[PDB]
Amino acid sequence: MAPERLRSRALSAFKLRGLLLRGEAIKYLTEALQSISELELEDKLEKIINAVEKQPLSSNMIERSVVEAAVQECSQSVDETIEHVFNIIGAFDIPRFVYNSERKKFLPLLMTNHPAPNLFGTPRDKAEMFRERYTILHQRTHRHELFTPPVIGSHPDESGSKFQLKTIETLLGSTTKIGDAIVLGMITQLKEGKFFLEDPTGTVQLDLSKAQFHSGLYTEACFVLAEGWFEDQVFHVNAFGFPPTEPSSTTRAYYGNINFFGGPSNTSVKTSAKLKQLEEENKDAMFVFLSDVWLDQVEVLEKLRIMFAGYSPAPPTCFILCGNFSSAPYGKNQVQALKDSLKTLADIICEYPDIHQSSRFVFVPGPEDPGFGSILPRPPLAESITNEFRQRVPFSVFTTNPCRIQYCTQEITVFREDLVNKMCRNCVRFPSSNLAIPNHFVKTILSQGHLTPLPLYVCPVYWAYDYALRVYPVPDLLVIADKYDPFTTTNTECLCINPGSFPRSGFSFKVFYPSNKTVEDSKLQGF
């Protein structure tokens, strides 16, 4: 085709749509379109212009990179992809949204006055953690059926389905011995035995002589609906309860499909037709999850060899190895032992090259593993430890703890901490045994909407990064890796699972199939 007419028509095609091409962009475009004639040229131009406009364009002027991506997408090249299909997101990479009350909308921080998060936070940020936790739970609470009736919704007035809400500052006043007060607030043992409630407006004593408590494991720093009456600067509790939990369908139906989970997608990955198709392109799309994988033990390494033997047929897309990787985490000794662990793991992986090229391997280190273990979100394992594994197994990613894994349209959260024991020791009211403890824990986590519903000295967190620990909206998987007990539970279209601790589960572990969201037990105890 004539280069001058091809250039003129391509420039005109972009110009009529209001787009300007730089010299490199138009040159590359003419080279890419040189093999096409008038039977296809204009349709090709319209298609690639649509591909350009789909991208996050910041200006009418187009660099060569944008048209490169557009024409490559027009030429496919996304067949059997891993990008857009499987992402591991570090906790520091999660977008920092903030809920604005006047707009009643989540805004990204670039659209606000909020500063960037950093470890050495201000005195304000320490309060901002709990203030934002209250804010998210507050906007969650007021959208429940407890909301006031509409305009003459009932001929007699109703008290918000008998669940009308108030804050602490409102009842510090004329409302003495009002028998129907309900307040959202944080439980605190602000004096020993003399518990208090707190919200962003103020504080008040809790007379919890009767608790009448709904199922859930109550601790200090838990936010609760305290139902009771007020007298003598004391809130006399009639009942305690958590705020009701939302499904992600409800949350995204209200706020739209914002990508709260993070990752490359601008929208929530749960709503995408192409990604819905790519999720099911492999009927046995599959992942494996383990924890406390003590590779400083020869026994763990040999049993891992047997597990690779067992999953040579139908290998996963990725193996997920949660942390506390060591029998003996005790410093320099374990730095060298983890180097040896990863050398031996690379040897084993090269002894199964089919699994090496078929599966990825990701690591979520625990609080006891070497490095900045004790404060969350933990950074990844030290790069000097990983370096040989980086070059010998490029099909692997050491990442933060917690980390967010996305597989196509589904949301997986991975977090290593022995939190059930922490929660039950910081318990305010010993729960009823009729519901199992992992169900109590999962209900508490989902209702509190946070991975660490405990005081800061119980769960040390970098203050400005506390949003990364937030469970909101509810994901597809809560992979809470914990010594306590391997388990599987579910609520609000999530499956909340624990792979246990591999040396103490008798070397049992978990398997997950996102194509049908099923979970299977690797019951390989005699392996």
Partner 1 sequence: TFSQDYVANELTQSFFTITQKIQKKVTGSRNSTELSEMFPVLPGSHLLLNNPALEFIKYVCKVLSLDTNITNQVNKLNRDLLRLVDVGEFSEEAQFRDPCRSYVLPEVICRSCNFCRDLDLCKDSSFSEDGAVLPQWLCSNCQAPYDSSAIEMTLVEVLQKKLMAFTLQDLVCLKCRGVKETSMPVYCSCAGDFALTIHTQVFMEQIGIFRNIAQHYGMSYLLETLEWLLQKNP
Partner 2 sequence: VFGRWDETKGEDNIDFMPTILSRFDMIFIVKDEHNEERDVMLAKHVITLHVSALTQTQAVEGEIDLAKLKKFIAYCRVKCGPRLSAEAAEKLKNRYIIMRSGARQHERDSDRRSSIPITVRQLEAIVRIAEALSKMKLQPFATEADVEEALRLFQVSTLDAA
Q: How many other C-beta atoms lie within 10 A of the C-beta of residue 47?
A: 15
d(CA 431, CA 218): 8
DSSP string, 466-503: GGGGB--S--SEEEEE-SS--EEEEETTEEEEE---TT
Concatenate the DSSP letters of all residues of 102-125 into one string.
TTTEEEEGGGSSPPPP-SS--HHH
**Options 92, 253, 254, 518; binder of partner 1; rule CB under 8 A:** 92
Report the distance separating Cα 360 and Cα 339, nearest Å.
19
Sequence-distant (6+) residues with CB within 8 A of 513 are 284, 285, 286, 287, 519, 520
Nearer to partner 1, 92 or 254 (CB): 92
Whether residue 294 contacts residue 327, with contact meaning beta carbons closer than 8 Å, is answered with yes
| Closer residue to partner 1, CB minimum distance, 371 or 431 | 371
Q: Which is nearer to partner 2, 173 or 353 (CB)?
A: 173
**Choices 123-131, 165-173, 414-422, 438-446; region in contact with partner 2 by CB under 8 A:** 165-173
Which residues make Cβ contacts (< 8 Å) with residue 109, sequence separation at least 6?
95, 96, 97, 98, 115, 116
Tell me the closest approach of the beta carbon of residue 142 to partner 2, in angstroms: 13
CA distance 456 to 471: 17
Q: Among the candidate windows 51-59, 118-126, 164-172, 244-252, which touches partner 2 by CB under 8 A?
A: 164-172
Q: How far is CA 170 from the centre of its chain?
A: 35
Task: Give the integer Cα–Cα distance in Å for 277 and 417.
Answer: 35
- The interface partner of residue 377, options being partner 2, partner 1, none and the CB cut-off 5 to 8 Å by kind, is none
Give the nearer residue to partner 1 in terms of CB position, either 68 or 220.
220
Q: Does 126 bind partner 1 (CB under 8 A)?
A: yes
Tell the smallest beta-carbon distance from residue 87 to partner 1 (Å).
22
- Asked whether position 201 contacts partner 2 by CB under 8 A, the answer is yes
Binding mask 192-231 for partner 1 (x = CB under 8 A): ------xxxxxx----------------------------
Q: Which partner, partner 2, partner 1, none, binds residue 195 by CB below 5 to 8 Å per kind?
A: none
Question: Would strands 410-416 and 403-407 be described as parallel, antiparallel, or unpaired?
Answer: antiparallel
Alpha-carbon gap, residue 301 to 281, rounded angstroms? 33
Please spell the DSSP secondary structure of 379-446, one letter per residue: PPSPHHHHHHHHHH--SEEE--BSEEEEETTEEEEEEE--HHHHHHHTBSSPPPTTS-HHHHHHHHHH
Q: Is 294 in the site for partner 1 (CB under 8 A)?
A: no
Of 47 and 166, the one with the shorter C-beta distance to partner 2 is: 166
Q: Does position 232 bind partner 2 by CB under 8 A?
A: no
Give the shortest CB-190-to-partner 2 separation in angstroms: 18
Question: Using CB under 8 A, which residues numbered 230 to 269 contact partner 1?
Answer: none
- What angle is formed at CA 427 by the lines to CA 424 and CA 433, rounded to 5 degrees? 65
d(CA 114, CA 124): 12
For residues 456-475, which are near partner 1 according to CB under 8 A? Answer: 456-457, 460-463
Asked if residue 269 lies in contact with residue 410, where contact means CB atoms within 8 angstroms, the answer is yes
- What whole-number distance in Å separates Cα of residue 342 and Cα of residue 340? 5
- Helical (H) or strand (E) element with 299: helix 298-310
Distance CA 475, CA 508 (A): 24
How far apart, in whole angstroms, are the C-alpha atoms of residue 255 and residue 130? 22
* Least Cβ distance, residue 422 to partner 2 (angstroms): 36
**Of residues 234 and 382, the one with the C-beta less far from partner 2:** 234
| For partner 2, the closer CB: 233 or 312 | 233
3-state helix, strand, coil in the chain (%, to 5): 30, 20, 45
Closest CA to 522 of 506, 501, 507, 508: 508
CA distance 308 to 273: 34
- The footprint of partner 2 on residues 77-106 (CB under 8 A) is 102
Total residues at interface with partner 1 (CB under 8 A): 40
Site for partner 1 in 327-366 (CB under 8 A): 331-332, 335
Q: Does 148 bind partner 2 (CB under 8 A)?
A: no
Residue 119 C-beta: closest distance to partner 1, Å: 5
One-letter amino acid for residue 130 of the chain: F
If one asks whether residue 215 binds partner 2 (CB under 8 A), the answer comes out as: no
One residue of 18, 23, 56, 123 binding partner 1 per CB under 8 A: 123
In whole angstroms, the minimum distance from the beta carbon of 373 to partner 1 comes to 8
End-to-end CA distance of the chain: 66
Picked from partner 2, partner 1, none, the partner binding residue 173 (CB below 5 to 8 A depending on kind) is partner 2
Site for partner 1 in 71-90 (CB under 8 A): none
Q: Give the range of 169-177, 308-316, 347-355, 432-440 binding partner 2 by CB under 8 A.
A: 169-177
Shortest distance (Å) from residue 403 CB to partner 2: 37
CA distance 148 to 35: 66
Among 202, 244, 371, 455, binds partner 2 (CB under 8 A): 202
| Minimum CB distance to partner 1, residue 267 (Å) | 29
Q: Which entry of partner 1, partner 2, none binds 382, CB below 5 to 8 A by partner kind?
A: partner 1
Partner touching 126 among partner 2, partner 1, none, CB below 5 to 8 Å by kind: partner 1
Residue 102 vs 145, nearer CB to partner 2:
102
Residues near partner 1 (CB under 8 A): 92, 115-116, 118-120, 123-124, 126-127, 129-131, 186, 188, 190, 198-203, 331-332, 335, 371-375, 379, 382-384, 456-457, 460-463
Residues near partner 2 (CB under 8 A): 102, 169-170, 172-173, 201-202
